[PDB]
Symmetry: C3
Subunit: 159 residues, 3 copies
């Protein structure tokens, strides 16, 4: 029940959600390779959160680095470039892939909350970069869900 | 990590679960329109929970009203009318649509718990109606999972 | 929001995840019967967690017993016997069934955490056996996800 292990576990749950999007959503090769890299990153993020930060110069760190986040930000900008402006707010769903990426997005957001909770529990011994990674990942998953809805998104109505 | 934002986020997770039921479960037109309306409501419910109640007469409220709950109750009664009495307790699953509606039901129940937690954290500034909506929605999703299992539900055995 | 009802609810969420694996993953007859028995057990586990332990000799107990756990352990050993040694760490995903069993595994792990939290809240009135059952179930679901990936698992890369 420790905050570190809750954050680690939520990262695993988010990773499984991405695995379901891959296995049931039939993404093309490019999107598959992006999501496969994210799964690799989420393993690293869970390892990071579960391992207290110590001044241990003896073993190679398994930690989220800023470069991981920079990569997600670049993919956000490159995939969002080819999308039109949102007319209304988006409801989660659409194509199978888009719906499954929305599920993953919401699990990632839950993992982000746990990762921040771990930082609050251990400001010195937990890195903020897993949480920042998860923050950017939820944006990327939103963008990819739109990419996977070629005929338009499901839109909220004030009605 | 605030209780309001946890409740908002769980509503989004429940909404994504409904989106997956729609996209992978192949519901007929009537059920689709019901679930699409619920997705619209869950957006409203998240907005409600995330917005503190203030005596602000200047902007149009985005709030769950009793009418939302009355509608879910009416759909419960109308869909349950055409179902036989339960012989045993139901296990979640069956047809793809029924299984996905059971997943959604369990996420909705989690969202309900968070929505009550937000009320407990802010009895004056959080509405009870999102939680009551989520309570009735879990009943409706149970009923719809049975509707989507024309050949019978999966039943628990004392054995 | 009581710890007992959170644990009960997480068991239901895990059960629904297994129901989705059954309905969307097309398991063979043997695996289906194993997962169907687990669903029956998870109903019992939720009932156990939600019912305070009292010295009530008057009604038949609905409780997880050690035999439930022994059964899961036996299935772990029998299914793992026919698998090769892991070369690297596994990422969740692969075949549809494997991916859905990984989702279920991660929900089961969340349910395990809640079940331990219920024990901590009520050391005298809550059984430890639901939590121990959920612990062994996550192992079994991992093993079954590998069984369902005949062409190999998705592997983490240090790269």
């Amino acid at each position: 029940t420790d905050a570190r292990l809750v954050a680690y576990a939520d990262c695993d749950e988010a990773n499984a959600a991405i695995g379901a999007a891959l296995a049931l959503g039939h993404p093309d090769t490019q999107i598959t390779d992006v999501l496969r890299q994210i799964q690799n990153d989420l393993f690293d993020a869970g390892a990071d959160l579960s391992t207290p930060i110590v001044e241990n110069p003896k073993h190679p760190p398994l930690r989220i680095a800023q470069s991981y986040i920079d990569r997600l930000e670049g993919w956000c900008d490159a995939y969002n470039a080819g999308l039109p402006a949102l007319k209304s707010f988006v409801l989660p769903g659409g194509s199978p892939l888009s719906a499954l990426l929305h599920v993953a997005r919401t699990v990632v957001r839950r993992a982000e909350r746990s990762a921040w909770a771990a930082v609050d529990a251990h400001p010195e011994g937990v890195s903020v970069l897993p949480a920042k990674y998860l923050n950017r990942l939820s944006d990327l998953l939103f963008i990819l869900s739109r990419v996977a809805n070629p005929d338009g998104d499901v839109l909220w109505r004030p009605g």
